[PDB]
């Protein structure tokens, strides 16, 4: 639609603007029950081929049941939290005696009933497989009437189709300990996930968003085990509970802005250590530094609120004036001057440094730009390949408008003979304070003689 | 059971105490063999529906066999090692000529026989699928008697059931190059894994531990390809070999203990860069900084000792006295003062900083705490939700006892105008040495005039 961007040459930072987002401000627990069956014995003294097939399938189902019984740069400056606390909470509140029979009694007639539970928390509890009502009288009475013989052959294939879900549950849970992400489609069928999304206490706008975009909801949930005994086998599929809706979440990319000097390796360098997402919520912004935890599906930006910092809104004025005395922008200091490129949402930021050959090549024309020294930006329209040194990046071909804010780099605002190049993480105010301290150092060393 | 915890307000660090653990001090290699079959030709000039089905299945099996033939903060300060050296070692010692013929000769009668091999290493080598004994005379004589026609119809479904294991082996290995993790259930059936754990040269206590907890053993092993030829397709599953048993592994969480000052962003702030697990083994402690590599299944702490450091026992006295001159505690220095919360095993550590509203809300009462400035701890009993700024963490609901020791933050023990805040990793002795050096500079610069 209107995914624009701006490129600021002050720090050679890209800001892609217009990315109406959806955070993950809450969790929501929902207790899937699979109605299991208990079999006393499957003796079958007689032997036929189809009876051998159904015996092997029942043995695999029993082994699955026994299995389930046995199955009971600004990244450091963040907040770490376990992401499965709600599911463990409802599992612990299930594990007390008496709640299982309440679940089974409340799910006898209705398919998608709601259980009040002992804790006062409402959990949606609903069967999805109902294997008990199948095994009840379809296979056990047949197995024990004609001296363990099946008249038809389609029954074992029907049992295969019904038992595939439970066997995949067994495999997917046993591979991933007890907590697995993402939730698979045989873990929760998509019609049932749509019905569960529609039936849980959320905004109708969030219903529209999370029914149009069930892929990210599926890719963001967490399914944890619960009680298995009393043939009730249950697991909690903790689902995301999205908070703010359609909020402009601008994305910030940065590339190393070094000096233009070529002599040896004596170069000063500011790299803005602030890359990631900035979503607007409440009176603040959520900052997501982990670009691997925020999904970019369509033009909506789903994210993980638990893996975010909070910042005041003045960080928006960080985008315009890097020396603005309202918010302290975070930059990092470095002396290495390697050529590096980061491809933004539409264009590409390049910094070709020392002696390297970079070009912006289009597959229908050839090289068109041939970047010189310094940070530079190449728009989406015109190019489809960016080569920096001997590495090739493909630039995103997503349509939109680009703006180029002209200016001079902040390298020219610093004095190289006194500039500090140790800080892995710092700020503009801290760097300027150290510059002032070292300038007073120079002046007091001058006046001491 | 008795998972206790302590909160130290000196560095606002949580230590959860009592986590009887299990390291991974060794590997153990085991040679799974799938008995393959060689088919000269499957011509079948006549055609039928079921014969077409069995022909497509045999073609899929042949393609799978051909593909198998073609298939032949303290994180930097660690020790990096390849995790699959034992499986590669036994694969290399198998690759020499004549070994797999010995495997077949020793595995003809017994289903779990042991071979001595040429290297002197004893490897448990055994069959799990025995497809050669099935294809021997169940399908090939039938295919070549009634002009390529099958009288029955369940034989192809039985062949599907038997070939599902080999086809899933092909898929799971071709997806993950040659080395996959975790080992899947169709890669090694759990009855076979329990019998293999029972038969391998380990403590009986460790047998009980890895039979009750086959989940994490399944989630820590590594399966590697081996020789494919001579219809004796083999692969080595390298199983963890747990060392110490039920040793206390106290967990250390830290949160940024920044200063209480509010003027601009001139804050002096200490973050203990020591988070992770602490197990006791031999006369030392093993330190796991990677909290993503240690599983916390039940109250047992399985870990990966290849990603651990060794420390003397005096690091335990790092917990009580941060200025103790027996072990040098590791701290990091920072000026940024964002609000951050980590959630310990039972409670939550919060630090609400600058102008940031945080609360500890219970779902049945509402907000109960409303943290002020400074580090603070909120127990499990009373809350189930911790909001810091605009982010919402769920706190673990695991039962246990909490202690809250009283004291003053160590930032108040430091001088604001002389503190060094550029150390990504440092120690108490190093920081105090730099403080002493800078104070000596201050006194010599005062005395120079």
């Amino acid at each position, epitope marked *: 639609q209107n995914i624009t961007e701006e490129f600021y040459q002050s720090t050679c930072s890209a800001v892609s603007k217009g990315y109406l987002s959806a955070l993950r401000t*809450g969790w929501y627990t929902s207790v899937i029950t699979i109605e299991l069956s208990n079999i006393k014995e499957n003796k079958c003294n007689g032997t036929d081929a189809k009876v051998k097939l159904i015996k092997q399938e029942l043995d695999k189902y029993k082994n699955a049941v026994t299995e389930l019984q046995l199955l009971m740069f600004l990244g450091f400056l963040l907040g770490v939290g376990s992401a499965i606390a709600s599911g463990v909470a409802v599992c612990k509140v299930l594990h007390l005696e008496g709640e299982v029979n309440k679940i089974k009694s409340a799910l006898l007639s209705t398919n998608k009933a709601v259980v009040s539970l002992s804790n006062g928390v409402s959990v949606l509890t609903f069967k999805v497989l109902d294997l008990k009502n199948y095994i009840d009288k379809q296979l056990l009475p047949i197995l024990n009437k004609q001296s363990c013989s099946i008249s038809n052959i389609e029954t074992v294939i029907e049992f295969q189709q019904k038992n595939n879900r439970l066997l995949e549950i067994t495999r997917e849970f046993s591979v991933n300990a007890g907590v697995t992400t993402p939730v698979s489609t045989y873990m929760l069928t998509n019609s049932e996930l749509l019905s569960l999304i529609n039936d*849980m206490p959320i905004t109708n706008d969030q219903k529209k968003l999370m029914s149009n975009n069930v892929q990210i909801v599926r890719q963001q949930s967490y399914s944890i085990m619960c009680i298995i005994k009393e043939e009730v086998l249950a697991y909690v599929v903790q689902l995301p*509970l*999205y908070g703010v809706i359609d909020t*402009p979440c601008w994305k910030l990319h940065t590339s190393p802005l070094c000096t233009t000097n070529t002599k040896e390796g004596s170069n000063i360098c500011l790299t803005r250590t602030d890359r990631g997402w900035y979503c607007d*919520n409440a009176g603040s912004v959520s900052f997501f530094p982990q670009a691997e935890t925020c999904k970019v599906q369509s033009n909506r930006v789903f994210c993980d609120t638990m893996n975010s910092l909070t910042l005041p809104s003045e960080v928006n004025l960080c985008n315009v004036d890097i020396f603005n005395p309202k918010y302290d922008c975070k930059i990092m200091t470095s002396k290495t001057d390697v050529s590096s490129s980061v491809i933004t949402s539409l264009g590409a930021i390049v910094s070709c440094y020392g002696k390297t050959k970079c070009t912006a090549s289009n597959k229908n024309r050839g090289i068109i730009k041939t970047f010189s020294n310094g940070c530079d930006y190449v728009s989406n329209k015109g190019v489809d390949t960016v080569s920096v040194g001997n590495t090739l990046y493909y630039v995103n071909k997503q349509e939109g408008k680009s703006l180029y804010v002209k200016g001079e780099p902040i390298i020219n605002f610093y004095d190289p003979l006194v500039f500090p190049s140790d800080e892995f993480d710092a700020s503009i105010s801290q760097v300027n304070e150290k510059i002032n301290q070292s300038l007073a150092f120079i002046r007091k060393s001058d006046e001491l003689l | 059971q008795n998972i206790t915890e302590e909160f130290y307000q000196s560095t606002c660090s949580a230590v959860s105490k009592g986590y009887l653990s299990a390291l991974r001090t060794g590997w153990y290699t085991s040679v799974i063999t799938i008995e393959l079959s060689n088919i000269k030709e499957n011509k079948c000039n006549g055609t039928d529906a079921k014969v077409k089905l069995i022909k497509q299945e045999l073609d899929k099996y042949k393609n799978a066999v051909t593909e198998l033939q073609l298939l032949m903060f303290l994180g930097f300060l660690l020790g990096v090692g390849s995790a699959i050296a034992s499986g590669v070692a036994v694969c290399k010692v198998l690759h020499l000529e004549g070994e797999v013929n010995k495997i077949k000769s020793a595995l003809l009668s017994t289903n779990k026989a042991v071979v001595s091999l040429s290297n002197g290493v004893s490897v448990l080598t055994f069959k799990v699928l025995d497809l050669k004994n099935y294809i021997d005379k169940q399908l090939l004589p039938i295919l070549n008697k009634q002009s390529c026609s099958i009288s029955n119809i369940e034989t192809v479904i039985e062949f599907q059931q038997k070939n599902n294991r080999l086809l899933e082996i092909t898929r799971e290995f071709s997806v993950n190059a040659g080395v996959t993790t975790p080992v899947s259930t169709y890669m090694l059936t759990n009855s076979e894994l329990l019998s293999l754990i029972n038969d391998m040269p380990i403590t009986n206590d460790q047998k009980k531990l890895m039979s009750n907890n086959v989940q994490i053993v399944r989630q820590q092993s590594y399966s590697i390809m081996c020789i494919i030829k001579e219809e004796v397709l083999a692969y080595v599953v390298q199983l963890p070999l747990y060392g110490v048993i039920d040793t206390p592994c106290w967990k250390l969480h830290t949160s940024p203990l920044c200063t209480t000052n509010t003027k601009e962003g001139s804050n002096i702030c200490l973050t203990r860069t020591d988070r992770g697990w602490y197990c006791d083994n031999a006369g030392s402690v093993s330190f796991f900084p990677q909290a993503e590599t240690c599983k916390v299944q039940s109250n047992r702490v399985f870990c990966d000792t290849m990603n651990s450091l060794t420390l003397p026992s005096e690091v335990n006295l790092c917990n009580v006295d941060i200025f103790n001159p027996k072990y040098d505690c590791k701290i990091m220095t920072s000026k940024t003062d964002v609000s951050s919360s980590v959630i310990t095993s039972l409670g939550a550590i919060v630090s609400c900083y600058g102008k940031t509203k945080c609360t500890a809300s219970n779902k049945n009462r509402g*907000i109960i705490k409303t943290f002020s400035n400074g580090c603070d701890y909120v127990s499990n009993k009373g809350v189930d939700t911790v909001s810091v700024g605009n982010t919402l963490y769920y706190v673990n609901k695991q039962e246990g006892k909490s202690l809250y020791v009283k004291g003053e933050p160590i930032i108040n023990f430091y001088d604001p105008l002389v503190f060094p805040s550029d150390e990504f990793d440092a120690s108490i002795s190093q920081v105090n040495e730099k403080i002493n050096q800078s104070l000596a500079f201050i006194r010599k610069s005062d005395e120079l005039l």
Partner: antibody
Amino acid sequence: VQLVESGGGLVKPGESLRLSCAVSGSMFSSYVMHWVRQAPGKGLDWVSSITGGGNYISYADSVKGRFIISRDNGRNSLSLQMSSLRVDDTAVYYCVRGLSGVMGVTWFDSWGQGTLVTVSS
Amino acid sequence: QSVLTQPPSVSGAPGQRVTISCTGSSSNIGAGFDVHWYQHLPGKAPKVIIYENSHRPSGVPDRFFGSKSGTSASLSISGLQPEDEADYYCQSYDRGLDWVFGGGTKLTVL
């Protein structure tokens, strides 16, 4: 944070008009906004909603499709196109700016002054 | 006409506790949803006294105490004071008519 709007008066039934809201907030980009109404006699009701960018329009069941809600993010304003009119729509209308919930729901925070729209005769 | 039902004939003298109670259907309130209460003195705009059934905004005294249970919400006022005569409300999030509003209770002193 106070909301001020204008556009009221007497309007004959049937014809359309525009009712504008001139919120002077500082972060009118994330807050979920609504319009509510109240008539003398019967209780207060709900009219319309809008969430952020403007891709999640939601309406009441009493009036659907007839009212058009839009907002100018750059100019910091709301607007309702009042297409078609019946007798029941004579009411005092309130802009209402509310924050996102701990789950997703809005509790209708600080309200506007309230503009009277009369449609009788 | 609204799905929210409360009797709009509740009044009491200043001094004692008066409880306003409003109940909803199964689709609203009891299906895991929330109930918020607003106040409507004539003149100035309505403002929220209580949201999420427990919390309070910045300027709200200790007179107001709200609660919800099942499909019924209540709001108790302890020790009435004379200028509290207004229209107290309940709101909910019925999945049909989205942000449904109660009929309102006219609370007056005697």
